[model samples]
Target chain A: SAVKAARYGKDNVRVYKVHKDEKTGVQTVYEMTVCVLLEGEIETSYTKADNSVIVATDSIKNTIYITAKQNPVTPPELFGSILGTHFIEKYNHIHAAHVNIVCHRWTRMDIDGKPHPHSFIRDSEEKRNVQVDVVEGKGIDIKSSLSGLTVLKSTNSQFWGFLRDEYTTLKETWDRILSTDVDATWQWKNFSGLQEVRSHVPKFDATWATAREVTLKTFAEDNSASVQATMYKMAEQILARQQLIETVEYSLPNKHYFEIDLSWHKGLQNTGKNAEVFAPQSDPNGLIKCTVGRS
Target chain B: SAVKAARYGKDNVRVYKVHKDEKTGVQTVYEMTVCVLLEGEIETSYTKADNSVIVATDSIKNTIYITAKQNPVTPPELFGSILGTHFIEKYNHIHAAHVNIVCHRWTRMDIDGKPHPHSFIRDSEEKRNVQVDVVEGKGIDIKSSLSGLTVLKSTNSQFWGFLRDEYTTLKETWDRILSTDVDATWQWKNFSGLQEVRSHVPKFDATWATAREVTLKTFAEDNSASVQATMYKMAEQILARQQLIETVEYSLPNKHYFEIDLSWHKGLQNTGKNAEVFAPQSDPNGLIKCTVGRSSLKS
Candidate 1:
């Protein structure tokens, strides 16, 4: 046996930054959990029990804090690019840097009709995430995503016209509750360097808003056929709207809400038309995925 | 290393139940993620590839939904006990059943100062969880817990009075920001049977409330101490309050908010007394764990 692969750094690097508008007395905060891993010719650290030839994980964590203190953490795409590129540029031997960040939502609270400056609430678990890869001599790559956007439409969704087999247990339905924690990623075209990435900074945030709006709106209005079909439409619209994006990928789990059969108790009609109570299964969910690129 | 141990079942089984009060026109909702694993004379399933001894995982999932349909899922300790007991009684070969449940908060929304009937919000990631083990002949054992209660205090926290060494870079501070996601568990005295567990039904919810209240209140009030010292106060009070509980355990991670020395960026005062903006470290946290029993607590 031989050492085939080796990459190590820091993970779960939770960072929070506050931007205070001294003029208007408005404070905006950004909190994200970051993970940075580096790969180079450092196999001896594993095979030879080497304390040398390796940048300490603790130092990587400090660097993340320092980088955030010095630079913008928002429009996570830019921040991730800068963070990832720093490792590859600062170290002579380190060839690649992989940075993953999950930005937490702290939507400003609205009291009465005005937005409170300093106070914020975690409105949802929804997150905007980015993965950046900076390889030596190969340019930079980033995949931006929005995930944990849980949404449910009671009557607009349907599942039918599918393959039937002996293993099939689901019945065809024309109207059903469609719910999923949406995970959508759009891969950006590889940039030449951090300069090119910074040039397209505005596009990053705008495209994210576009992708999220399209996902929710399409999910609400589409009188759907299946998760696969509906998700394909979402990815298609995303790819068409953003020219910088190479491919749009969507992974959605079909969260099932089964109706309770209360007929066994007292002839209570709770299935089909009279279905009000439902048992949402946590496991054994049908996961659907698709990636659409420009033709 | 010859087949030391093995247990398997379905996990991530999300369940939701709603109880509608016909007379008052009120409804309550409960959502939980459940896991049920069984162990008995089932080593053959792993060692010999024998499928006969296994009561399928899918069947365990169906049993969860069916049981929820028939029984009350509230006051999770009772529900966990009943679910675990069913496996031991129904399956002769399956001698032990381990049921773990995490109840997600579906806090009823207050629309215009009145509670809404069907609507709810995932108020927080904080969860009420239970771990139950039912042995065939033995009693049912349970451990109830509340986890992911993230809290932070701007002041009234101190970390000092520790033996300093060359490796210690931390400076003892008089005032600092203390934040942690609280994980507290209380072990119940083993009940002889399901009937005994059912008898202590009201205590389950009441004890949970007491434990959570003590945790938040103690956390808010404790001053001038370390994580180890502060959490001991929380656990000690819980054990002292609940007689049915045999022991209480607390696991808290000292979520450090490091001051960014911005003196380099010109005359900036964001450290010590003037600290307002902070950076929350995600990894390499200081995790403190303690298990407090009747006479003493072990760290």
Candidate 2:
């Protein structure tokens, strides 16, 4: 019988910052698109014509930029935590804040044999993602992940042993191009005493770097039986190495590259052995996703 | 008989740059995704096993970064021109190059009634686009446009006066929300001797600014009869004011905002007068596009 108020905030506010090492003159830039959503005792703003309990979206936008300037070099997880904590602590009416930030991939360019100081080239379509959810009295829930990291292997992949029905019309292959953009998110376990000293969190940058390296190495080295099996092995390795992470989820899209039919090219014969060309199809892709966690 | 050869390059190489003015201590950034395709005397790279004449995509990526470092503050059209000309003039085998650049929207933040020096906010989901196609001897074909500029008017829109068949279930409304993300492209007229002075092109920044202002103003002020009528008027105004432009094309997606039915709620009247909520549907949108040009243009 009564109107219910909900959480609201602006999305996709991009903030760019460049940090220079005063001693070495090495510069690094972080370009991220941030989104903030707050929930609290602000029901009157929506149900009634009351503007007193509303923290303007414009002010939230300013707060993001100002905070980024203050902590220019912090990793995304800590940066998100700082912002989320600020909102919940600063406003008495606001009970919770959720901050999500995605940092675009920018790797330093190698000029000749040495890495250039200020020059950077986009590494790939991949992005580093971090999300922090903070409550008034309860602790924060922090998660980090990688998205849009497209990888492909020309060989060492197989697909078979699937349910064959009357409606199914897919051919099995032992050797095929395994291509996917890796989207993975992992959550940290909640420890009892860790909430007291939340500022001194674990080293997230090292864990993320190692996890990415392990993912690429596993895909390249392991002969994939199927997408599901490959994903399991990747997640299993990350859990084994990083003890702080409790659960990891992966959503990989199987970008198909069909072998071109060259039978009609007079005198040219195309077979699996001599197949060099392919027709890249993006749609109707096989989306395989899973979550591997502790029991 | 000899085997033919061809050339190609990668598209959609995203680059983000930040420039600081030393005197005023002000900073500006330009984030753009650049696409380059080239043609030349080299065809063996694809048909035959020859990469000696091929320029690596890695090298092309470096060239974009290096060129941007040189002209950090140039507008997209001129910057694209510089890039397109560089490939043809630098290599002997490459004869033509096409450079297409799209700059994302970023506006300075208003702090205490003054624009902040180093702070910026993403204005909208729109982008400014420029594409320059240049050949060795022939002149460049330059075009600029705006895309993803989403606008909405709550009222003063009508949809009626159309044939209603059995399949048509949409009811006519005199006042409804009119919304669209404007995609407009305008091309320059080819004038004699302009090709010779390709480096000295017209100021495209001013034209783009005025065209955008005119589009937002017209969309907000005009009482739109339909999406088609409003789009025609928008294209016509751009062509009339910007004389350098020879042709203008608009592709507007009618972002539907359907009125929610509140009949289930007891004693609630849900008509246009009390329709405060709308469900946005993006999948099934009406797309209308047209090209308006001078009389000399080929129909």
Candidate 3:
């Protein structure tokens, strides 16, 4: 029995870039954790211990720093495309370069009523994520998403019509708080076709900004019957607005808010009107997720 | 049905702060996700919608910003104690305040053999965590830990001599990579008693730095037979070094690095020497946790 040779590249390479405007002294900082995995004709590098075809992961890390210094600060999707393209173009042996980058959430700080010039604050636990897969002689596959964006509504949500087994102890409510840390991914349908124009690539920024706005706005305004129904609505709205988006997938964790038993107290009478005092329970919360796309 | 009037507060409010030194133009940034839960006599605010006793969560967010500006940049345990103590002292009805903070990892960038003052890179997926419980007329309970610190050693770890079951598909290996994300918490036993001296609180910084170093050193140096044996040794060493630490608990997830099959490729052999290309498997990972404490201390 004989074995074939194959080699794999980097994991968990951290990259931090701070871009400063030379004239104004203002800075734009991007902290990202990037991982690049390569596949190609580089088998002897592993089987024979040959170092000629292997590109050092350290060199890959350095390239990220140097590339950020040269390129414009832009959305992660475009930046990821730039990285994926560089690897396949630079190396002849490498056929495919999969670049995954996650940018930390940073929003400009508002001092008094105005946004500060240089100071920024981490927005939420959520992060912006991008993945670009570039293969030789083939167009790129780009996908981006927002992760860990936690939001809650105290009311205007309901849960009912669930199967009640003998062991079921849950009581249904018509009005309750619906909360979830939003994990949404939107993929470009025909990015290769759009890339021919060159100007169409920048539309990703506008599309991302609008998709986020539409998702949040729908969640706030729509009276949700269930997490599934609410998620479907949110996904539908995004698809309706963004023409280039082929599919939107959402993983919504139904963060449960249990009503406390205030009746245990003497002479305390709390009802639906006083449902504000509830205990936030997380361990056994409901996890609802689905992918919405055009048929 | 009637409900009881109980006061509850929100958890997991994220706060981030960045501080720059005036002398060197260097920057120090702290990104912390804060959770503040208060317990007291403010039941009517929730039950009857009374706004008087209700301190808005917005105010709690603002206080985190204002307090960071006023105080010096210090360890999270001390900073948490400050925030917890402030809520208890400011509100007469609020009897106890619980403040839990998790600070994200940041390491100063090494630029040309020198640590750059203004540049830093995200250290790890791990975070430093602190919990401070401040009760009126009672002393504070301060606890801290390291979380999400993922590490791996490609060789020198072994798994053998375990009870096998009918469903066991795992083959014992004499040598394999031992990997885990360290989540360990150490609690101060007599922190309240030491607080009477006012000067003893500063020792927390030294204790934290030592605890982290000791944990990493033990993991790297120990020739482990099993995850359980390795964790017990790590906990025991921390207790041995830090006398102030009463109890230490560790939650270690055994991140598996499976050896790749190269038999089909027809010219490659991957033994321990060439085992640099193992697949990282996370799901169905072994999770082992335990709390080691002195027999005299309460569990």
Candidate 4:
């Protein structure tokens, strides 16, 4: 086995160029981070070095900016593949390279109750994140995840059929407030799977998009009995409908939201708009994950 | 096996209280959300409806505030345990329960160049998250984790040893910059573990304190060659030093922190101050975990 290795670094160089178009009222902003990593031989001078495995980390940063100019790849799958392909083809010593991009969630700025086209405001909805990895001639692995996707239901979700003992405080419930911070990831299928149904699935070019759509829809509409069941269903649906998918994994944290019982103050607030109190607590969270196979 | 069952519901209520402290000259505000769920059925209204198993979710919410006031647990662990214990004792139909508390990270307000004594401001250094679970009397399983433990190290790290073939382009190195936003978690050993060796192992009272200290120190001190190796080392050390921790798991996003090369920027402002740029690199982050066990082996 090779000697274990690790390093930590930081960068303070980030420049966001903001521009506003007068005619179309469309605004464009460019943000990029430049970094450099020197590899192969710390003591040897550049002239005496034998190792050619160093692909400047700075180049990786530059590649992001240049790729963006080449029409941003809509979803993570395509974007990651584009970046991964570049490294594998350009360098020979580079055994493995990984690139991660996090797009800060921003909403169009509101002006006089209307969202402005050229301006934007930061939103707390969720962030779009992607990670790309290239390993020699081996295939690349890409993961697209959305964090902070906050979902809530006033009622309707349950958990039960678990082992019980002294600390068995969770009742066999038919209903309760169920919510979680969604962390979902899907893998890309190989060439055989892609060709299997490219003829039938003309509208969808990439397996990643299909899987993502299925996950979002299933999460939104499925009457979840348990987080595990719901996650399994999401994966199952993707495999059933798509051709190019190896596997899909979903992690839904049981972000416990407690209901307020305010009989102390006066009476309850069960009127039209004021019908519920929700509390986010640091409690025992339920974790459920499932994998769906293609039939 | 019987079919598994569960439900999530929200109570219909919202309230707030505002007050001022006479001695400190500081304003205080409190807000809360209440939601509930009842597992199995009992006799809510004569019918054998599953509703009978329903312990009012409002009761759960009320417990959050009342328990804190009555018990006053400084850290979240004690508070979480109180909730877990309440549900198990209160509802018989309840077979299992989970409770979580997230305190907003707040810091004292800053006046002038210094922090105010009584006044306060929301620090938002990532929320302090704690979770506790009491399952069928099978000892409480508690986990404490922090979200925004932002760390950056300039230089002093290296990597090598990867299978070679076509499409390999990363350079081997002895030193490079490393950065990551850490999400570290540790499971506390049973309370008995603490009692037996409390004197020998310092700072073993809680998992949060132990894991937090171990993570920060390991990253700063360990000459890491790979993120995976660093993660394992951190967990291994915590278990080695502290008897109250069974294991530790860390998910470190290899946040790329590259030192900017000024040789290209023709006209760059802040050439002295804002010269080095830091960008969040997107890549398949390194994930690692280590589980510690009794070295002596039980008889």
Q: Per-residue lDDT for A155-218 in model 3, tens only?
A: 5677788999999987878877666668899987745622542456677777777767666666
**True A-B contacts kept by model 3:** 0.00
TM-score per model (chain B): 0.95, 0.89, 0.86, 0.71
Q: Each candidate's DockQ score against the native complex?
A: 0.13, 0.02, 0.02, 0.06
**Fold similarity of candidate 4's chain A to the true chain A, as a TM-score:** 0.69
> Best by lDDT, which number?
1
For every candidate, what share of the true interface contacts is present? 0.20, 0.00, 0.00, 0.00
Q: Rank the candidates by DockQ, best first.
A: 1, 4, 3, 2
Which lDDT tens digits does candidate 2 get at residues A33-122?
A: 889999999888877879999999978976775566555335788788888888988999999898999887556645445765654444
Residue-level lDDT for A57 in candidate 3: 84
* Model 1 CAPRI quality: incorrect
lDDT by residue (B1-299, candidate 3, tens digit) is: 44454445556755444454669856555556778888887767767878888888867765665555455436777777777778888999989888888886545545446655543444345688888888787778878898876555545688888889998987888877666778899987644522441465676777777777667666766788877887888788788877878899999988776665444445344445443234445477889999998776666
DockQ of 4: 0.06
Residue A79 lDDT in candidate 3 = 75
Best by TM-score: 1
Candidate 2 Cα errors over 4 Å, as ranges: A2-5, A191-202, B1-299
Residue-pair clashes per candidate:
2, 2, 9, 89
Chain A TM-score compared with the true chain A, each model in order: 0.96, 0.92, 0.89, 0.69
lDDT of 3: 0.69
